[PDB]
């Protein structure tokens with residue numbers, strides 16, 4: 042496990058940098074520093090009220106453990122990861138592959154977890170999405186119904202905090218007028234402004250209106266190696282899904298040298314739709330509402346020794 046210290050501006054500073062960027066991409070933008078809303082309420086319904094306190098990102102494993110051929114031995118425990126990143130009782134959000142070792146099929150994982158500590162009873166509020174073997178569509182389930190553990194597999198991009206109320210950056214962006222998705226626009230704005238001083242960010246956003254391109258991985262792994270993005274995209278199942286969607290992004294402006302996934306966003310909803318976010322497909326009507334914080338630290342766990350740049354969209 043490697044630790045890296047991010048650059049951490051004010052709140053006020055980031056807000057102003059992100060607004061100017063987003064204004065180039067979207068017609069109606071507002072970014073401001075606000076009190077975090079109570080995230081135990083709808084539409085989030087997290088096990089904790091906020092995303093503040095001891096913020097950090099964990100990048101665990103990677104796409105090179107999935108592709109070209111899968112190493113199914115690469116299994117992880119998110120409760121244990123919390124201790125590894127020096128925050129027992131961390132509240133964890135983000136995106137990863139689901140635990141096939143408990144579920145019995147592949148899936149997209151939406152970790153939403155109050156991990157265990159001496160003062161915090163654990164709650165696994167995670168969701169998982171997998172390809173319906175009936176009609177090829179999306180089946181979204183709450184992990185705790187099917188399994189009672191903290192497992193995931195292969196790769197995870199996570200934003201961890203103490204889950205406390207406090208100040209966060211609120212982003213309102215409506216009507217896309219440029220080619221970037223919501224997350225890419227933010228990440229690329231931060232990199233353009235800050236350069237050599239890396240910034241990491243996470244939290245949650247709602248797609249309130251519009252549709253998106255997403256994907257879900259098939260229930261079983263390929264026998265043959267998936268050696269290119271074209272081959273990977275043929276194996277993956279793609280969808281158009283509709284608002285409202287609750288999204289969990291993790292993004293980093295510049296990789297200081299840890300073989301990072303720079304952008305990764307998974308989502309769930311109350312209407313049976315979830316998976317891996319690509320972009321919105323209705324730019325004139327799309328509405329995003331986000332709550333974000335910068336990360337103080339990056340932790341790199343089980344970085345692949347053998348790597349490549351395939352399959353990172």
Ligand SMILES: [Zn+2]
Pocket residue numbers: 136137149305306307317318
């Ligand atoms: Zn994904």
